[PDB]
């Protein structure tokens, strides 16, 4: 496969403001009404978080410094996964997370990822609600060890915190219906853990997996009509800081200070 779409688009990155965001449960310890001071990797309050919108979707490989915060507006299922890894090439194992509509597949293979990995989306006229997904992510994917299947991870804002600590890939998620116009909202929400995969690989780079429609076909281009819907996803970076996480009576983190 591997149709490349990054023709020339080279806009300078834009920054929105992640007001008070990406505050996950950094622990499995229930706490009563107590102000507990935690010192872990966090996304600092009122930081500049880079914005990727359709303008379509440069979608580059991004640094995975210590762990990232991922948000998406995505009123239609167009964000489809991520391809965390070191070289994103053969000879080095990479991690692939893809969810279809009813199931999420996680894989740690020596993928040979495309330069512009994405998923084609087609609806057959016989049953319109089809979403026949075609993979244009890797060209070769073999000799792999980990394969986990569960229910899917995913204007319906969704938030993620990935971090790679001592051999574990930790995912914290929080899905929220949102009314605010364009950017991240202001209401405090606490992300909570999904999974802890014993991946045990080195992650330094990551890239998001989009779902593109084919709007038209010129005979030989392969890059003709890949429309990218309408969405926006934000990548923040976690820094080691000290918060003061106020726990509720039931143990939910209602508040925090940097």
């Amino acid at each position: 496969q591997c149709v490349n779409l990054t023709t020339r688009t080279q806009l300078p990155p834009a920054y929105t403001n992640s007001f008070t965001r990406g505050v996950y449960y950094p622990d499995k310890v229930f706490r009563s009404s107590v102000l507990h001071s935690t010192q872990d990797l966090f996304l600092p309050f009122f930081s500049n978080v880079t914005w990727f919108h359709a303008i379509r979707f440069d979608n580059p490989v991004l640094p995975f410094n210590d762990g990232v915060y991922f948000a998406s507006t995505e009123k239609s299922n167009i964000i489809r996964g991520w391809i965390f890894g070191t070289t994103l090439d053969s000879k080095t194992q990479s991690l692939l997370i893809v969810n279809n509509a009813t199931n999420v597949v996680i894989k740690v293979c020596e993928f040979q990822f495309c330069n512009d990995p994405f998923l084609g989306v087609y609806y057959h006229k016989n049953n319109k609600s089809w979403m026949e997904s075609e993979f244009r992510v890797y060209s070769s994917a073999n000799n792999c060890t980990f394969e986990y299947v569960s229910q899917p991870f995913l204007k319906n804002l969704r938030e993620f915190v990935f971090k790679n600590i001592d051999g574990y890939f930790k995912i914290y998620s929080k899905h929220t219906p949102i009314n605010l116009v364009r950017d991240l909202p202001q209401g405090f929400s606490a992300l909570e853990p999904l999974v802890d995969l014993p991946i045990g690989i080195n992650i330094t780079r990551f890239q998001t997996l989009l779902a593109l429609h084919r709007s038209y076909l010129t005979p030989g281009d392969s890059s003709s009509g890949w429309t990218a819907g309408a969405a926006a996803y934000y990548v923040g970076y976690l820094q080691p800081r000290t918060f003061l996480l106020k726990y509720n009576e039931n143990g939910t983190i209602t508040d925090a200070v940097d």
Partner: antibody
């Protein structure tokens, strides 16, 4: 891409032949390939097809067990091994690009690029 | 799987042609159309039962419904004389029509 067939020539029935289809560019990796033949006075007849990864191969019932399609995206080339040749196999053989990557997507496109075919004659 | 086309259709230049294709529940599948001039390689002109590739004039209009797929050539010109092939897939096996010739008088 631009496709250019080669390898078609005179062969006696029971013999063998290997066609080739070299793509102009390297976007050939993003294309399912199809072989199509045309008897010298008849209509087009689908022979076989292979997907972008090569993991999805289908043949016509009239060539099952004799023809073997393959590709190598490192050489941007498509191959057809043609064994146990019969007289009804004489035709002009075209190689065409589908556009879809897998068989679940073949029906969503048409054979948009056609290399000028190569004439295969099978006569005693 | 089979596709049935009329051997020939003839229309005067400036008129409108109609090339039809019939098959058992052909309207539940997508039908491509190809134009082959005498002694040339075919050119796709209609795919997904209505959509043209870029560069194909808007007078090449097609539709699919039930067991019949039709191709329509409005304002037929002398450059349109060619054979036309219906095409479909059946359990990942390609299928071509018989091939309808079009003689532009």
């Amino acid at each position: 891409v631009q496709l250019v067939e080669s390898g078609g020539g005179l062969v006696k029935p029971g013999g063998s032949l290997r066609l080739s289809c070299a793509a102009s560019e390297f976007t050939f990796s993003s294309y399912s390939m199809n072989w199509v033949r045309q008897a010298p006075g008849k209509g087009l007849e689908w022979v076989s097809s292979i997907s972008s990864s090569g993991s999805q191969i289908y043949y016509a019932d009239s060539v099952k067990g004799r023809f073997t399609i393959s590709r190598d995206n490192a050489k941007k080339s498509l191959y057809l091994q043609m064994n146990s040749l019969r007289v009804e196999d004489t035709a002009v053989y075209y190689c065409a690009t589908n556009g879809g990557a897998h068989s679940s997507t073949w029906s969503f496109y048409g054979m948009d690029v056609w290399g000028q075919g190569t004439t295969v004659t099978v006569s005693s | 799987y089979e596709l049935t086309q009329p051997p020939s259709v003839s229309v005067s230049p400036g008129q409108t042609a109609t090339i039809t294709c019939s098959g058992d529940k052909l309207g539940d599948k997508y039908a491509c159309w190809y134009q082959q001039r005498p002694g040339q390689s075919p050119v796709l002109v209609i795919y997904q039962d209505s959509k043209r590739p870029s560069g194909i004039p808007e007078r090449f209009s097609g539709s699919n419904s039930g067991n019949t797929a039709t191709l329509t050539i409005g304002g037929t010109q002398a450059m349109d004389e060619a054979a036309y092939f219906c095409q479909a897939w059946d359990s990942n096996t390609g299928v071509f029509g018989g091939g309808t010739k079009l003689t532009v008088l």
